[PDB]
Amino acid sequence: DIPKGYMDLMPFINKAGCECLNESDEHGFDNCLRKDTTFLESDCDEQLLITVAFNQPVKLYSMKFQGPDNGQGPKYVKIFINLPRSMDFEEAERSEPTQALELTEDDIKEDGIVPLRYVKFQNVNSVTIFVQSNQGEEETTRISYFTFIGTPVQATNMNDFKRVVGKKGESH
Template sequence: MDLKGLITKNQCECLGGTDDYPLEHVFTDGGNSLKSDFDDQLILSVNFNQSIKIHAIKLKAPEKFGPKTLKLFINQIATMSFEQAESCPAVQDMIVDPKDLAGNLINLRPVKFAVVNSIQIFIINNQSGSGSTQLDYIGFIGSPLPAGNNSISTDVDIEGIKQHKQKIINLLKSDRPPKINDMEEYFWTGYSPKTLGELYDKRHELLSIIHDSNLFAQKIAEIVQQHHLDAATENKKAT
């Protein structure tokens, strides 16, 4: 199903766009366009009023100036800066075929987008590699998650945790919990400061099992899963 009815428009944000072509235009097919300002890069941050699963996206744009290279992130606590979006590993990287800018379904990796409260899309360049990027429409295809859904476990990348094991250990061995102003150092996790704080609070338990990479990764995944589930519950209460 089309998820546009679940978008919380007043909590969405665009970086790099012109004032004359705001983000809200592109949620309506056939409406006005969104255009980048100084170069061809844009960051779109789209919030939903409940937890959802996203299967695919739709893009409509001119073939010459439509988005080409994308990085997709989910469940960020705030809109990422361009520097953060460039340096952080994405949930999914994507090269858009020009023919798909006619509104064709662009499938996402289902496991990566199984539990989504917000999605951030970094448009790195357009099809021509110069000029202003134009986006006429973006749509999200998927389904809302039922209340109390526990499938959030699929949202945690166990292999990614193993890959960044040493960085996580360095965080746990720090003499103070992470702060907002040094989050850039830990943005590789894709987790919010609150989640990282929870990992830090359980540092003694986690450090005692670092010899077993599988157990270490699974325990971190459990903590992250619980945080995401709690956050989804709070978001639902707020709406």
């Protein structure tokens, strides 16, 4: 599927980046990261805060929060970007998201792709999803599969540098 000129942002995520919260130990973030029946389900309650970091800054265009039709699929999600620190559930309840989104049942299906306010996502390095509610108001929320679509922003390797031509060694 995917849109025109965009590619999956999955190859750019970082394993050190992933800090999904409130996840059940049996069913984790890697599960909702896979295109399988493996899914993430929350542990304490329906609230579920999941953060992901990227190797290079990336422009996000759309997101696919696919989830099961058992009523545990995400309903209301707050979107935050470029968090400096780890983010608390109370803050997520009180902080203004980069984008507040209300998924409908069609969005949560396996073919359901959710558009994003692409203007607000141009130098995104770490996204945070605050799943606040589910359709069926079930005790725990399940994320069947979720990835990000967009495009890399053409960053550079800071420490790479290196001399290329010139005096080789000493100058003014």
